[PDB]
Design an enzyme around this catalytic site. Structure first.
Site, PDB file in Angstrom:
ATOM      1  CG  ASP A  69      -2.027   1.100   1.131  1.00  0.00           C
ATOM      2  OD1 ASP A  69      -2.353   1.582   0.023  1.00  0.00           O
ATOM      3  OD2 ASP A  69      -2.519   1.509   2.203  1.00  0.00           O
ATOM      4  NE  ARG A  89      -4.040   6.357   3.769  1.00  0.00           N
ATOM      5  CZ  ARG A  89      -3.860   5.098   4.182  1.00  0.00           C
ATOM      6  NH1 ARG A  89      -3.484   4.125   3.345  1.00  0.00           N
ATOM      7  NH2 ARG A  89      -4.068   4.802   5.464  1.00  0.00           N
ATOM      8  CG  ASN A  90       0.296   4.239   3.881  1.00  0.00           C
ATOM      9  OD1 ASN A  90       0.020   4.339   5.073  1.00  0.00           O
ATOM     10  ND2 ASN A  90      -0.461   3.553   3.029  1.00  0.00           N
ATOM     11  CG  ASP A 118       1.093  -0.094   5.808  1.00  0.00           C
ATOM     12  OD1 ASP A 118       0.194   0.617   5.309  1.00  0.00           O
ATOM     13  OD2 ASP A 118       1.009  -1.336   5.840  1.00  0.00           O
TER      14      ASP A 118
HETATM   15  C1  LIG Z   1       3.477   5.102  15.703  1.00  0.00           C
HETATM   16  C2  LIG Z   1       3.690   4.350  14.414  1.00  0.00           C
HETATM   17  C3  LIG Z   1       3.695   2.966  14.427  1.00  0.00           C
HETATM   18  C4  LIG Z   1       3.885   2.235  13.263  1.00  0.00           C
HETATM   19  C5  LIG Z   1       4.075   2.873  12.019  1.00  0.00           C
HETATM   20  C6  LIG Z   1       4.311   2.124  10.743  1.00  0.00           C
HETATM   21  O1  LIG Z   1       4.180   2.707   9.683  1.00  0.00           O
HETATM   22  N1  LIG Z   1       4.702   0.816  10.753  1.00  0.00           N
HETATM   23  C7  LIG Z   1       4.996   0.023   9.626  1.00  0.00           C
HETATM   24  C8  LIG Z   1       4.476  -1.265   9.512  1.00  0.00           C
HETATM   25  C9  LIG Z   1       4.796  -2.069   8.427  1.00  0.00           C
HETATM   26  C10 LIG Z   1       5.660  -1.624   7.423  1.00  0.00           C
HETATM   27  C11 LIG Z   1       5.989  -2.546   6.251  1.00  0.00           C
HETATM   28  N2  LIG Z   1       5.000  -3.606   5.983  1.00  0.00           N
HETATM   29  C12 LIG Z   1       3.805  -3.071   5.309  1.00  0.00           C
HETATM   30  C13 LIG Z   1       2.787  -4.198   5.098  1.00  0.00           C
HETATM   31  N3  LIG Z   1       3.406  -5.234   4.250  1.00  0.00           N
HETATM   32  C14 LIG Z   1       2.438  -6.274   3.877  1.00  0.00           C
HETATM   33  C15 LIG Z   1       4.580  -5.813   4.920  1.00  0.00           C
HETATM   34  C16 LIG Z   1       5.605  -4.709   5.206  1.00  0.00           C
HETATM   35  C17 LIG Z   1       6.215  -0.329   7.549  1.00  0.00           C
HETATM   36  C18 LIG Z   1       7.165   0.245   6.515  1.00  0.00           C
HETATM   37  F1  LIG Z   1       7.709   1.472   6.915  1.00  0.00           F
HETATM   38  F2  LIG Z   1       8.207  -0.650   6.260  1.00  0.00           F
HETATM   39  F3  LIG Z   1       6.446   0.451   5.341  1.00  0.00           F
HETATM   40  C19 LIG Z   1       5.883   0.468   8.648  1.00  0.00           C
HETATM   41  C20 LIG Z   1       4.073   4.277  12.011  1.00  0.00           C
HETATM   42  C21 LIG Z   1       3.880   5.019  13.191  1.00  0.00           C
HETATM   43  C22 LIG Z   1       3.891   6.447  13.054  1.00  0.00           C
HETATM   44  C23 LIG Z   1       3.893   7.622  12.983  1.00  0.00           C
HETATM   45  C24 LIG Z   1       3.931   9.047  12.839  1.00  0.00           C
HETATM   46  C25 LIG Z   1       5.055   9.805  13.104  1.00  0.00           C
HETATM   47  N4  LIG Z   1       4.771  11.081  12.904  1.00  0.00           N
HETATM   48  C26 LIG Z   1       3.509  11.189  12.520  1.00  0.00           C
HETATM   49  C27 LIG Z   1       2.717  12.304  12.183  1.00  0.00           C
HETATM   50  C28 LIG Z   1       1.416  12.095  11.814  1.00  0.00           C
HETATM   51  C29 LIG Z   1       0.873  10.797  11.774  1.00  0.00           C
HETATM   52  N5  LIG Z   1       1.606   9.756  12.089  1.00  0.00           N
HETATM   53  N6  LIG Z   1       2.945   9.929  12.469  1.00  0.00           N
END
Ligand SMILES: Cc1ccc(C(=O)Nc2ccc(CN3CCN(C)CC3)c(C(F)(F)F)c2)cc1C#Cc1cnc2cccnn12
Length: 278
Positions: A152, A156-157, A170
């Site tokens: 995804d 937005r991500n 994500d």
């Molecule tokens: C607290 C928090 C927790 C978790 C995550 C998060 O994104 N986790 C994540 C989970 C999985 C994956 C990769 N998979 C995708 C699915 N796929 C099937 C497998 C691989 C990745 C990735 F970065 F690798 F993409 C990230 C972000 C935040 C944030 C924040 C934040 C910081 N500033 C702000 C300001 C405004 C709003 N939000 N914010």
């Protein structure tokens, strides 16, 4: 004060990631789907134990099921394995033992890339837009090297720091991202690195439309039938054909004909260099 599901799972103490609950003061909400809240963390760099830091903390709601917990635990463990990189949102710590499950990451001050672009529309120079695209390409190249498929990728991500560093994230589905998906993902439910390359093409289009909504006017039901006739999005206003060429290459029907993230990193670096030269 953890939930019934979390006590039942009884997660172990990960010594590389477990951060004390009492050294974390929660603040303003940042996003909702679980939910993300801004927080002050003390000693997140353990060499400087008294040093304060602004972090983002993901957690489940009061009305969350055991499946929702398992997904957050699954998210926690995926983030551990990916590793630190300049253009991925950095995991900082977790809280699992003495209360509700918290997943702690760095706080990107300027929020998500879509709202960053939309907020800075005219009533953002060209090097800044190329930098955004290039940095996301570098993050996705890193993801692919870790054998990780996003599924995804969208504006937005992607998060944006105070220094305009792009951090891939994500947040789950918005309150199905049909307009960002490769044909094989939409229709055959097959996800690959090359299906992420399609989405990167749509992200490029978002960046150079300053956070525009893809396929404007066309409803989601009519989109897939239109794609397999060979129709794609037109070149947006104030976008060179070099960047539009990369978008059209990303939207090749055949995944093998689409560029790799290595190739996209190389091509965008030439554009970054060209716009900086003079
Ligand atoms: C607290 C928090 C927790 C978790 C995550 C998060 O994104 N986790 C994540 C989970 C999985 C994956 C990769 N998979 C995708 C699915 N796929 C099937 C497998 C691989 C990745 C990735 F970065 F690798 F993409 C990230 C972000 C935040 C944030 C924040 C934040 C910081 N500033 C702000 C300001 C405004 C709003 N939000 N914010």
């Amino acid at each position: 004060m953890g939930s019934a599901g979390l006590v039942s799972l009884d997660l172990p103490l990960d010594p590389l990631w477990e951060f004390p609950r009492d050294r974390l003061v929660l603040g303003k909400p940042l996003g909702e789907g679980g939910q993300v809240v801004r927080a002050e963390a003390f000693g997140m760099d353990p060499a400087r134990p008294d040093q304060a830091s602004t972090v983002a903390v993901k957690m489940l709601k009061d009305n969350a099921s055991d499946k929702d917990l398992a997904d957050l635990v699954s998210e926690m463990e995926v983030m551990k394995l990916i590793g630190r990189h300049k253009n991925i949102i950095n995991l900082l710590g977790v809280c699992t033992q003495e209360g509700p499950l918290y997943v702690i990451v760095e706080c990107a001050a300027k929020g998500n890339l879509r709202e960053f672009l939309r907020a800075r529309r005219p009533p953002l120079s060209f090097p800044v837009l190329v930098s955004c695209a290039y940095q996301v390409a570098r993050g996705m190249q890193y993801l692919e090297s870790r054998k990780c498929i996003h599924r995804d990728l969208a504006a937005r991500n992607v998060l944006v720091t105070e220094d305009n560093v792009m951090k891939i994230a994500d947040f789950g589905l918005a309150r199905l991202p049909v307009k960002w998906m490769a044909p094989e993902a939409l229709f055959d439910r097959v996800y690959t690195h090359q299906s992420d390359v399609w989405s990167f093409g749509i992200l490029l289009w978002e960046i150079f439309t300053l956070g525009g909504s893809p396929y404007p006017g066309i409803p989601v039901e009519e989109l897939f039938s239109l794609l397999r006739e060979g129709h794609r999005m037109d070149r947006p206003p104030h976008c060179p054909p070099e960047l539009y060429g990369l978008m059209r290459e990303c939207w090749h029907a055949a995944p093998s004909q689409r560029p790799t993230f290595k190739q996209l990193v190389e091509a965008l670096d030439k554009v970054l260099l060209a716009v900086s030269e003079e």
